[PDB]
Symmetry: C3
Subunit: 656 residues, 3 copies
Amino acid sequence: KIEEGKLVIWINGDKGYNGLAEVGKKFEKDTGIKVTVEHPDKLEEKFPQVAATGDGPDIIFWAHDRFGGYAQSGLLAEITPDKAFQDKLYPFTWDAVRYNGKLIAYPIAVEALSLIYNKDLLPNPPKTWEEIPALDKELKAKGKSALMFNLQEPYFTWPLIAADGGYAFKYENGKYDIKDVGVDNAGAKAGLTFLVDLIKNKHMNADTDYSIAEAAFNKGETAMTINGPWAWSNIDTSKVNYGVTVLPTFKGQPSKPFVGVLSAGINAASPNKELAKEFLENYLLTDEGLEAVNKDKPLGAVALKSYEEELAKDPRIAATMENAQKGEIMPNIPQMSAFWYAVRTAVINAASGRQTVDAALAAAQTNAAADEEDDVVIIYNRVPKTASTSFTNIAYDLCAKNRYHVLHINTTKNNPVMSLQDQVRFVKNVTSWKEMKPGFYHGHVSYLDFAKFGVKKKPIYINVIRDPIERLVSYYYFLRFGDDYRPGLRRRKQGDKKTFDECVAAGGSDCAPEKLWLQIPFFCGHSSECWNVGSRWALEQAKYNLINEYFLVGVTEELEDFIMLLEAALPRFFRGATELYRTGKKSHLRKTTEKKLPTAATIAKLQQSEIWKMENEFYEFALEQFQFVRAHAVREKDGELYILAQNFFYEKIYPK
Amino acid sequence: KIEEGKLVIWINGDKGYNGLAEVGKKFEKDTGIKVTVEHPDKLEEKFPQVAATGDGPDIIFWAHDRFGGYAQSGLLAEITPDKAFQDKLYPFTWDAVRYNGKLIAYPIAVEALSLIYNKDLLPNPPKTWEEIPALDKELKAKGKSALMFNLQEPYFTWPLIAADGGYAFKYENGKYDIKDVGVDNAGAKAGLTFLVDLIKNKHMNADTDYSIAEAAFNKGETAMTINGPWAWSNIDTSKVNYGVTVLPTFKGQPSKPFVGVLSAGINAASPNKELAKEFLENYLLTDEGLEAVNKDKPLGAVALKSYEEELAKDPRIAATMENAQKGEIMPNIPQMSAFWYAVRTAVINAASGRQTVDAALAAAQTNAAADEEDDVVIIYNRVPKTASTSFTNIAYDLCAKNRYHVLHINTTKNNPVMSLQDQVRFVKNVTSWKEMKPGFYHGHVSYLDFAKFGVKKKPIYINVIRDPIERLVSYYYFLRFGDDYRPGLRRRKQGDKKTFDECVAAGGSDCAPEKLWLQIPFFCGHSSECWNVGSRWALEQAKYNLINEYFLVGVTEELEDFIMLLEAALPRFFRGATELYRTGKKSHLRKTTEKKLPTAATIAKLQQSEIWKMENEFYEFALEQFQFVRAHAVREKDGELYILAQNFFYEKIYPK
Amino acid sequence: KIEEGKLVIWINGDKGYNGLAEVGKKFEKDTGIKVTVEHPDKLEEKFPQVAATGDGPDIIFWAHDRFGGYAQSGLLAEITPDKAFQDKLYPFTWDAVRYNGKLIAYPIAVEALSLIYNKDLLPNPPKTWEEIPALDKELKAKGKSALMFNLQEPYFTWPLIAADGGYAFKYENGKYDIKDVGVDNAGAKAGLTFLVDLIKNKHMNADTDYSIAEAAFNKGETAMTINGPWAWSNIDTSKVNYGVTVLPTFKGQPSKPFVGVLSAGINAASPNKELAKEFLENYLLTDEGLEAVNKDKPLGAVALKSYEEELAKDPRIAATMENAQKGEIMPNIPQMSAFWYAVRTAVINAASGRQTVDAALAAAQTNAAADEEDDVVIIYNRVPKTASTSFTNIAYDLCAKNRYHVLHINTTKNNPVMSLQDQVRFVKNVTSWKEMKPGFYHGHVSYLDFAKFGVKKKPIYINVIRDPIERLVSYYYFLRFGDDYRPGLRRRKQGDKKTFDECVAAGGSDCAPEKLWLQIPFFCGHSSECWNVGSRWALEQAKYNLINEYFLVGVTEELEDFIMLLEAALPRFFRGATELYRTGKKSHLRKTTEKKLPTAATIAKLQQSEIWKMENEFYEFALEQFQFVRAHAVREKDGELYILAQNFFYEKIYPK
Ligand SMILES: OC[C@H]1O[C@H](O[C@H]2[C@H](O)[C@@H](O)[C@@H](O)O[C@@H]2CO)[C@H](O)[C@@H](O)[C@@H]1O
Ligand SMILES: OC[C@H]1O[C@H](O[C@H]2[C@H](O)[C@@H](O)[C@@H](O)O[C@@H]2CO)[C@H](O)[C@@H](O)[C@@H]1O
Ligand SMILES: OC[C@H]1O[C@H](O[C@H]2[C@H](O)[C@@H](O)[C@@H](O)O[C@@H]2CO)[C@H](O)[C@@H](O)[C@@H]1O
């Protein structure tokens, strides 16, 4: 409960919160109002929650980039400083805290990342990134490391990714507004690739975080590091002779760090909006106020003109502004949250090798399109003997880390058709079982249309089918020789020497033409007509459902390409699926132990059947559709497939 | 407003809340904090509401089974007892209050239902249920009754339903989790059936509740009763010589009562989470604390080891544990809420005869699939002369009790096609008119696709059609002889002696082939093409809409089977519809007063028309589809149809 | 935070809030509880917001009409007056504050609009509206005006609109409930038309609001005005000799003002529900309480019997009741909110000429069907050279005032097919970009099915196509002579003298039959089959998507009729589009500078192509469908088209 009468302030732990407390103490001694400063973990995430329920701190401190979302969600109150106060702060800092014309926070300081090197180890810091690998080889030979910085927060990695071309909602002006994100273009790739190489050649270590980097550098174990003004305080204490300079260039271009402005917003639910205003305007935003804070951990270029003129003479601050200017001021639009998450995940995954750079960024471009939700559900009504085991298994292996559930649907005697009441039961489970979302449901069930049931959000359908004949042949020898997944269990007809070709020639049951009729009914659905072997109507309904209801249908013999596309369009589920497939062993699961290729004549015989022609028309339809999707989705280079970067943006947006 | 400084506790009225108050008083005398204990009605339902808005009690008392949902909804705060405290309570009781690894409540006591008989009336209590009918005959002859207990709460009935096979999310373990509900299998039916028979043979009375049972037994009017430890307190006061023993077996199997653990959770919005912890750990969960409570109304087997060793010597407690062990500890997963409602409604309806046991449980299986919502809307765009009056009337008769609305859509001159603007008007009404939900809208309107209008949740469509010719013949004589619904009103052509056959032979207007074109356009929709008599495209669109958009389409001559299926798939609307149809009189409403079967030659003539062929193809398509749904939905036994029990469950769920 | 211990009351600023304060002061002197009365702007809108979050005033004052919605949303607490109190207030006033059987507010006074004239200027006030124009001519010649009243609130205009036939949920009774709105019938039109004429003939001024009317009349500048009892207070101060009489009749019928009852409801979140009850029952609803208030600004006919008997002797109050009785008591059902907004917007737009009366009311009927939401999104995937520029431009010009966004979708090289990953990106943007809603997205993109992506709410699709050949011919000469939109930019083939006919005869590329294949794929979508020139399947999918997914598809040569329909079905977007089209100049944008009609023989040649036949079948299908929609949507009169009024309502609603 936001208590009235006192003030609760939240500020990140890397900042000088102890000094901030002193300003709180001064405030108590002059007004009698107690001021408590706290520094929670995941501050930028805790606030929007604890606050969305009329609770939380009175004043929230954070870079301006996230305040936009807080504003759009009505968690921030509008600040009303009179022009007398507004005039003592730099005009461009007020812009950082302006959302929809209103001022939603008080700016405090300008933060920008700089290169921080060890004078004793590296007399002359490197001007470019390209020269850091050679340097590390020399420094390694002396028991040292060249560079070390937080590879966990995209904040520290972004300067490089953006260097040659990456961006996020470039600041534009005009009668109209524009929307264009750019994390999957050449530049961004060239940048992240360079960083991934640095890890491959062991120049850097993928899981080095803020602390390991700080400790390493502050112990003179590594010549350089990348950090903000707040880090100077601890470096001073380590008697390390350091320097704060411009960031290394990449491809002849400067590193463009996303520049942020530390800001203080007032909680819209705060019953002390006034006391909050008094503290921030008459106490914190004064020379003595900022000094108390800055003495704890440097703020950088304060927004307060009177105190900046002083701090500006600090070489380190000059280095800050130099880098700051080489880059850009972060936007404060709501989209920013999705942007950071997308980029955060891409770097981490690219750095650990879980994803290639192409796959990592293609996914981030997708993930940046909206704030990630848990509301998604995938239904994969697998068709027997189509490599469904291999696939469904990729989901099982990725589900724990990717944070989603996998569930197998088991139907009595493996009947593809559920009763009407069971359909209702199934749909109700899938749409309401919140704890299973996001979820991946798979099973031997023909398509079931969720629309008829009045659901809010339909699930996403995907599938995999293979040539009609080959799947049958596969099911044939399967029943007689088992698989290599669970080799122990002898299948129902183990030890029948009758070959497929033999069965055809002798007109056996398991090789009858009507056994080809399977993939069509699985898509056609739970309709009577669907199960009339050879129905033309069912063949049309099958194609319509495949086109209208299915997200993507791949073919057994092209499983890899299928996974690649899914990893681009549905990263929450298949992020890292390609690498897993390409190097996991569990890639070609449940192979049939013994098989015997059909006869050129045995096939030509099956191909005289109406059932075959139909099931074949269907397969072709689906295959053409997959090849089409792949073709409009990727580009080839040296036999390698790459995900085309986003090819659309919004322009002429009105009003602004 | 959850006031800070004091404590508000909620506990059910059957428990010893007065004794709990004494513990509160002790707490006030040692800390100065006032403690108010209250016992509201529908406690388990009030909490989740009053609490979902940051209000309500500080501490909520209830069996552990519902705390799971409270947890998932963030209404409960995590309890932090140190192992010093955790060790003084039985380990299995802490498991009951564990949800998602966290401890969400303090366990207090173990409750289980036992058979409570009158030593003076029934010296030797019956060992099985099967012997209770004979016993009642003997006891009735002496002015007494054999057994009486609450038939309103499924809690008391469940022991019997579960005896031979019923269950709800059986507790399993392994690398994976499982989900399987079982309230519609043989066992559950055999159990509820037995109970329904006991009411049919007047051994028990369907609307006997907790009070009638307690009063009856405590007045020695009935030899037995089923209740929990809390009931002993009032029995002691009635000078009735009673005994607490094992529950009667059914089919050689023991009654498995759902075992619950009385638990105390702390409100997540409570500003006194600490005072709450102090009260529960140092005051209530102590020998003197539980004793104060237990002296008011027995708690059962307390979770506190030190005090259990004492109470355990009580024969009654031994009987409690005996029954407890014969059964199972209730799960605490969110699904539990839906489970209880489904079972509560099935018993009540089966017991009053509103539903047969099959229909009652088939519906509960459906209703257990998700928490009931009011967001559902059914649109029944009735086709003239297809028994729509009979049907729509079943909705009108069931709507009050089943809690939903029925509304008739009236269109100027009964035009099946609404204007584009009216479609928008209609859709807006149906999707936003919250107070009419759930709702049943019916009227002479052709299919209208809600998808095109950007709605969140589409409505559910159902319909009923009949043979093309017979419906026309029906409409023919209708216009001339009226119906028996409103016999007074003479219809537009009353007193035309021209028979149907006569009209055909003379090529009259009302019997023209083009008048057969009606059921097709009604499904095809509001598209121009639909209304071009004899359009092939319209015949295809009709089938597609029937398959893709309609929940279920029955045929006039099979109205009963149609109702049976709807009562299984949509119980909120049609619960009890079968019984109503089978025995209400208002079953064959609006019959046409006088009719004259067409001529074998008059029909053969209509059947030469393209319009007939098409409309006939449609009817056949729909009929085959209904027969198919019915076939995959029911099983026959002695000419009787039964709803197949659920044939699917989830396995290999990962992670756990 | 609704503070406990005091009382916060909200009342509209036109009422006597200062007098109400005096009652608050009396309450403080007898109980020590401070009472603060405030009068915010947009009170009826502020409450439901500030209150929906457990905050706001303790007591809310407003006419009973909106309290229904407040109730349905649980913002009001039930009032519990004992029959001793209930009996001292008129029974019909308690009905006004009864929602769903419960009493949700205390009634205070009955308000009704009356005609207020200047005795000195207009000795004998006009009995009918029809005689006011002549009167103004006489009064204008003397430097005066005849009538002036608030034309901004539909409250003041409604008496006239309802006079001859307009209504809103007429109060009915019976075993069943009824729902029927009537703002687009003859009467309502006849009424608003009369008012619009008064503005056309400059008898009144469209943007005259409450203040201008009050000032004008109170300065004797205008002979009459329409207002409530609250206005008498200021008129008395202006030494104007005024009289309060019956409202002028229209078409021989009396003006039926919507009668409202000023009511005081208690905030459901209020922690002082008792103090609130004490103040309202023992202080405000007493002779001395109402007198204090009434002395500030007359309340009208108080609900308190004892004090009404006094005030009832006031001629002015008699005039109030006379008008009140000629009209009806406003309903208090939730629908009322939507009703007022719809009517408020129609009057304003009709009065400014932005909409004709027909268009204004047709739209209000549509807008009254549900509370307006911002959640709507329109996607207009424009086809090249179909007048899309003219149309998309109407959106741009109307978006600022109509409060919605317009965005152009730009695809690399104008490719109609997005990649699978881009489709995901696009859909994610459109469904989650909250700040762009409502929105209008337009661009060269073929249909994209949002269903496959598991979205909550699909967007609305509209399009415009034209004859296959003429569009091609248009695209032909476009490339060679440019357009008049951006004449400067010379198009890719500027200065080719080859005519269309010439190109055909010489079998050129840009005039090839396969270039006709465009409108079909645009509707068929992102499927491979769609892009196989001449595919029969694609032609069927195109028709299905046009019928199943598109809201409305118009044809280039009938753009006006298309706009008219959209202005009726989607007023939020196209309100005023017709007038803009009919009189804006920017109506036929981007015309091709030079063209040359094809040859009767050149056409007959193209018409031999399979591609033409197909694309032609499609166009015809779409054209027939548009003509059909228009036909069932409008009526013609003197060559003029009018939107048919709503032709459906709900009857036999059960239960009541
Ligand atoms: O990298 C993601 C993260 O970057 C920024 O956070 C910075 C912050 O601005 C600095 O003041 C300092 O605290 O380092 C942080 C990185 O760990 C964005 O401000 C933040 O929104 C974003 O999630
Ligand atoms: O029967 C439905 C109901 O059963 C249980 O409630 C029990 C409770 O556990 C006992 O302590 C005692 O109060 O009798 C109640 C039955 O009236 C479940 O705990 C409850 O959730 C469920 O709705
Ligand atoms: O015209 C729309 C508006 O009308 C009514 O508001 C009246 C109110 O009832 C009177 O007491 C006085 O304040 O004039 C108002 C008109 O400006 C409805 O009560 C209100 O809900 C509606 O929006």
